[PDB]
Design a protein around this ligand. Structure first.
Ligand code: NI
Length: 341
């Protein structure tokens, strides 16, 4: 049955709640982004109204075959009326098409649901600046002070410099990047741009990327693997066995692989700077784990919440254990006492 933290009080609405069958009293299902833990349950047989971004709606129609008549895409940064309630979609700084949702309830309560997000000071100047928020449904994925990670810009600088150096030393090296969902496209696109190559990939992955409104995409991606020296593979194939096998398939065009796994956080973060990251190597294969996150660090999350000053916080992640819940509630209280709200 649907958990309370997916239900918006005072409305007929749910958020990211497609795996529970017909939710009692739900008149409109919102979807914040196209990640499987959130869309799980949608298909061509879904016949209730789904409200989402334009990019999310392209993915629903083309990948899951949801019928057009039930997809209701909304423009960002625009006040819209849904079943008599004003809503606004805001950029979540997560993956392409990902949104946060502002609900303006009929009684005067204002609720922000962040979906999945990577908090940024740029958010302090959207439509959030303009009114008070009473309740915050918060992405608490990395809600503990051990979770530090560098900026996305520092991580992409490291990746570009590492790839450009390796291929300039050896023009017969192949670069491989792992993927299993949308998100993190900058990693493989930035590396292909520095190398003067397109990114090669499966037809299924090319189809997914063509749903994303990324400018000049026909210019950066391809299904012709033979013409590309940057290849995208499933994340599960980014290991020495999977990569050895891939290199066999390239028919002696290449004699070395440099591969990237963009993880979120890993405990090499608590000790090591980005500058200092080293690969795992076996023979002619090297694998870099790079801390490219599309979720808030602890300090980013803290700053956003101390800026917004909500009256009540409802965590949406890590809610399944009493130790996690108690930990998070203790940090929320600290933040409120330190800031004075
Ligand atoms: Ni997500």
């Amino acid at each position: 049955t649907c958990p309370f933290y997916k239900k918006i009080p005072g409305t007929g609405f749910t958020v990211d709640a497609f795996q529970y069958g017909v939710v009692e009293g739900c008149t409109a299902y919102f979807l914040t982004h196209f990640h499987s833990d959130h869309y799980a349950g949608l298909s061509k047989h879904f016949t209730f109204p789904v409200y989402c971004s334009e990019i999310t709606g392209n993915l629903l129609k083309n990948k899951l075959h949801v019928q057009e008549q039930y997809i209701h895409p909304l423009p960002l940064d625009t006040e819209c009326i849904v079943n008599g309630v004003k809503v606004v979609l805001l950029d979540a700084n997560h993956c392409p098409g990902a949104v946060m949702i502002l609900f303006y309830l009929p009684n005067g309560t204002v609720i922000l649901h962040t979906g999945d997000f990577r908090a940024d000071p740029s958010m302090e100047r959207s439509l959030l600046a303009d009114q008070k928020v009473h309740m915050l449904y918060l992405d608490t994925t990395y809600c503990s002070p051990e979770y530090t990670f560098p900026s996305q810009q520092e991580v992409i600088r490291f990746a570009i410099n590492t790839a450009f150096e390796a291929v300039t030393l050896n023009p017969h090296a192949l670069v491989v990047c792992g993927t299993y969902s949308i998100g993190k496209e900058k990693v493989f696109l930035a590396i292909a741009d520095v190398l003067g190559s397109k990114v090669g990939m499966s037809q299924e992955k090319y189809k997914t990327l063509q749903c994303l409104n990324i400018p000049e995409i026909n210019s950066l991606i391809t299904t012709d693997m033979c013409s590309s020296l940057v290849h995208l593979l499933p994340m599960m194939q980014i290991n020495f066995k999977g990569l050895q096998s891939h290199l066999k398939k390239c028919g002696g065009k290449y004699n070395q692989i440099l591969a990237f796994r963009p993880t979120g956080w890993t405990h090499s973060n608590k000790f090591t700077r980005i500058a200092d990251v080293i690969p795992q190597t076996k023979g002619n294969i090297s694998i870099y784990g790079i801390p490219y996150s599309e979720h808030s660090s602890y300090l980013e999350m803290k700053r956003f919440v101390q800026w917004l000053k909500p009256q009540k916080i409802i965590p949406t992640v890590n809610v399944g254990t009493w130790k996690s819940r108690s930990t998070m509630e203790k940090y929320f209280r600290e933040w409120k006492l330190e800031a004075g709200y």
